[PDB]
Structure 1
Amino acid sequence: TTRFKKNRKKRGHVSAGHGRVGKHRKHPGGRGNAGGMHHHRILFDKYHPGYFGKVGMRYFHKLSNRFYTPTVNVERLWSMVPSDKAAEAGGDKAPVVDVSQFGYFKVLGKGMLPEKPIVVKAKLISKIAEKKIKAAGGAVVLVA
């Protein structure tokens, strides 16, 4: 929107806002990230520490799919239960949630669970996640 650009308010002002002494010159500091270790060293060290150097080890031909493990916490397992089936239950009778049908591979343990037992059926799980599920009275099932 050219009508709100501020250069339209500096018309009639000689320098267009860039100063009389230090002008608007072409590339007075160099182009791009020139001088990251010479004359932009303070800026690179201050705002981007860790920028220079080589850490760790290479992984020729990395495929992301090999590393895919979506995760869900136990605090979110009861939104997964439909209400009518959340009603059908006894003290020993609990719903079973295949988190694999919701796109999750591992179950993590953040958050609280209600007293109602649950049977989480997952590919992977953490220590605490099963410790919290058992403490609610439910069980864990491993699948593939």
Structure 2
Amino acid sequence: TTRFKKNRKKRGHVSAGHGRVGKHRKHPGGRGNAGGMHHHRILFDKYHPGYFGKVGMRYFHKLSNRFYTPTVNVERLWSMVPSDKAAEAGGDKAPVVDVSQFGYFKVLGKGMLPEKPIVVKAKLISKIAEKKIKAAGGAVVLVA
């Protein structure tokens, strides 16, 4: 939107807003990240600590499929249960939820659970998640 651009307001002011004393020449600091270790050093070591150097061991031909483990906390599980199959339940009967049917692999354990038993059925689980589920009375089934 040209009509808002602030250069149109700097019309008639000789310098176009870049100074008389120090002007606006082409590239007074180099093209881009230049001088990372020389004069932009203060910048790179103040605002980007850790830029320069090699850390960690290479992994030839990484496929992001082999690193794929979508998680769900325990706190989300009861949303997965429709109300009518929450009501079809009692003190001893609990809904069986297969998270892989929702797209999650691991079931982490952040958050509260109600007293209601729940039988989660996942491909992986953590310590705390099972501890919370057992403490809620529900159980665990491992599948794949």
Same fold by TM-score greater than 0.5: yes
Residue in 1 that maps onto 2:9: 9
Displacement of 1:88: 0.7
Q: Matches of 1:127 and 1:138 in 2, distance apart?
A: 15
Distance 1:27 1:128 in 2: 56
Size of the aligned set, in residue pairs, is 144
Deviation at 1:9, TM superposition (A): 0.5
Distance in 1 (alpha carbons) for counterparts of 2:55 and 2:40: 22
> What SS does the aligned partner of 2:78 have?
coil
Partner of 1:95: helix, strand, or coil? strand
- Tell me how far apart the structure 1 counterparts of residues 15 and 90 of structure 2 sit (CA, whole Å): 80
RMSD: 0.4
Shift in Å, 1:125: 0.2
| TM-aligned CA deviation for residue 23 of structure 1 | 0.3
Give the % identical residues.
Answer: 100
Structure 2: runs of 5 or more not aligned:
none
Partner secondary structure for residue 65 of structure 2: helix
Distance in 1 (alpha carbons) for counterparts of 2:83 and 2:10: 64
Match of 1:121, SS state, is: strand
Unaligned runs of 5+ in 1: none
CA distance in structure 2 between the partners assigned to 1:97 and 1:22 by the alignment: 68
Shift of 1:25: 0.5
Matching of residues 73-112 of structure 1 within 5 Å: 73-112=73-112
Post-superposition shift, 1:91?
1.3
Deviation at 1:66, TM superposition (A): 0.5
Query: CA deviation digits over 1:5-44, x for unaligned, max 9?
Result: 0000011110000011100001111110000000100000
Aligned mates of 2:90, 2:7 — CA distance in 1: 73
Give TM-score scaled by structure 2 length. Answer: 0.99
- C-alpha displacement at 1:141, in angstroms? 0.4
2 CA distance for matches of 1:8 and 1:90? 72
Q: TM-score, normalised by structure 1?
A: 0.99
